[PDB]
Curated annotation (Swiss-Prot):
This is Phosphatidylinositol 4-kinase type 2-alpha. The chain holds residues 101 to 455 of 479 of the full protein. Changing residue 29 to E: Reduces enzyme activity, probably due to impaired membrane-association. It comes from Homo sapiens. It catalyses: a 1,2-diacyl-sn-glycero-3-phospho-(1D-myo-inositol) + ATP = a 1,2-diacyl-sn-glycero-3-phospho-(1D-myo-inositol 4-phosphate) + ADP + H(+). It is linked to Neurodevelopmental disorder with hyperkinetic movements, seizures, and structural brain abnormalities: An autosomal recessive disorder characterized by failure to thrive, global developmental delay with intellectual disability and absent speech, seizures, hypotonia, inability to walk, orofacial dyskinesia, involuntary movements, and structural brain abnormalities.
Amino acid sequence: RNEFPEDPEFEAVVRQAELAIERCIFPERIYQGSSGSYFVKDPQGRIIAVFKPKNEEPYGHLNPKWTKWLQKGTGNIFEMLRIDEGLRLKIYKDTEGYYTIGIGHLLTKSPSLNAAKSELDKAIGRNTNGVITKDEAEKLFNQDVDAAVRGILRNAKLKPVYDSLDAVRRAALINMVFQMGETGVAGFTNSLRMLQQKRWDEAAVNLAKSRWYNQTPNRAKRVITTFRTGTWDAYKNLGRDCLVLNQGYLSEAGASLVDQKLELNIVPRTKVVYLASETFNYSAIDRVKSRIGLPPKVGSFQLFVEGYKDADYWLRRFEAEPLPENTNRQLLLQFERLVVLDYIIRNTDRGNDNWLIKYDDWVVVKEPVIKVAAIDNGLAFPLKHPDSWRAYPFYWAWLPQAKVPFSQEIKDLILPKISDPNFVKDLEEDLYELFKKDPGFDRGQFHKQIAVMRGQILNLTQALKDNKSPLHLVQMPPVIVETAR
């Protein structure tokens, strides 16, 4: 159901896309991405668009690279525990204060370091002097995994639950029996009944209350959601606690929405579009029912623009052979729009590869020589400000152009809009109408997104009024505007 009466030009392109698929000219997947990005083509084979299905997103269920991981099933227990337990080659104390070594291997509960050390020589077969190798630790690791697996199947209370769990949850239960051991996990008897009956939101509360979890919550919460959601998402990107889990396509489209309203026109038109292409990556299930073909995938659909190179490419040339003032001033005006965009949507990833430049008494306006396209916007709209601004900065801030004070021209375009609360309200409603279409939408998550955005506008407004530069703008302490309810 793809229709866009507001943008008949956009719709026409989409119809060429579909029709081209019918004729078996399929969108081809870019390898120069690292996700599910495709080049949409028209019946003549030309590239009209870039398409990024939701489910092929880096956190996406159907991403080809991480499908192999999903094949493993329980066998991901090795990697799963490697992440939680880490690797150390010399004796240390665990969270409870007990002597540990290698990968989560408990030597003893004794306070004596040589108890642990004696016990360690037994295991390895030599005099270790408290230091082992990577391989020795790996050898301990397997046995401890085996011991866990054994512990579960040898236990009357534990085993039934385990057999009823899918391959992924099973791995989670092993995780527990790895940390607390057989007997310890069997004191959870409540939750095991529940887990067995398949109620996920049921058990996830009760696991929140244990002698366990309190000691190691950072780890514990990682399992609870592996039980609840039956997926590996908590072990993927647990450093991007700044962004929503799998809504990049909406970011992409949202960025273009914002651009439209602010009238920046640096963002090639991007909308939510459904497509089916034999070239996509589908579940085995889906593949079979096609023999009534493949279902449409939901994704971001971004128009393709020609004549552009990477920002880095042009500035390199402009540094050696500086543009004439008037041309160079067209760059600067394009740059501000970018700065306004990224700040408003709070982009967390913008490099010199992420935006593009093109360098070439009347009723009509002379063409611009220079023009800026802003691509790859799916990493914006964070739930909150990054913990360390240095990790997720605004890169262009270190460019010399960011030192130059905001032009009156941009202020005239943007200040009347962002000073008008009914504009910002309308803008928030439009974003809501976009984001809510996602099955995994959460009203509470949304409010935080809006909060950052409302705080960014707050900062930008006063930056523009004071005629501050872009650089001085990002030095302004980040804020959020939160609704109390």
